[PDB]
Amino acid sequence: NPYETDELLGQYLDFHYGPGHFDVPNYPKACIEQALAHHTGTTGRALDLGCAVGRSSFELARRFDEVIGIDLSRRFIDSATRLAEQGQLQYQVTLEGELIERRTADLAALELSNTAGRTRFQVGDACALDDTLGRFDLIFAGNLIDRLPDPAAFLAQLPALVRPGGLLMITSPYTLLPEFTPRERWIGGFERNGQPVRMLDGLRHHLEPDFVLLEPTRDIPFVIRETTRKYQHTVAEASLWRRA
Contact 184, 157 (CB under 8 A): no
Question: Residue type for 29, please?
Answer: K
**Selected binder of ligand SAM within 105, 144, 145, 199 (CB under 6 A):** 144
Residue 126 vs 138, nearer CB to ligand SAM? 126
Min CB(130)–ligand SAM separation in Å: 12
Which H or E run contains 205? helix 199-207
Q: Which stretch binds ligand SAM (CB under 6 A): 32-40, 45-53, 159-167, 206-214?
A: 45-53
Question: Residue type for 32, please?
Answer: I
Count of residues that bind ligand SAM according to CB under 6 A: 18
CA distance 47 to 142: 11
Does 80 appear as a known binding residue? no
CA 229: distance to chain centroid? Answer: 25
Does 214 sit near ligand SAM (CB under 6 A)? no
Helices H, strands E: what count in the chain? Answer: 7, 12
Residues 3-22 contacting ligand SAM, CB under 6 A = 3, 15
Contact 240, 169 (CB under 8 A): yes
Contact 135, 164 (CB under 8 A): no
Does 73 sit near ligand SAM (CB under 6 A)? yes
Radius of gyration of the chain (CA): 18
Min CB(230)–ligand SAM separation in Å: 17
Does 45 sit near ligand SAM (CB under 6 A)? no
Q: Which stretch binds ligand SAM (CB under 6 A): 17-25, 50-58, 79-87, 111-119?
A: 50-58
CA 73: distance to chain centroid? Answer: 13
Binding residues for S-adenosyl-L-methionine: 16, 71, 125-126
> What is the binding site for ligand SAM (CB under 6 A)?
3, 15, 28, 50-52, 71-73, 76, 125-127, 142-144, 147-148
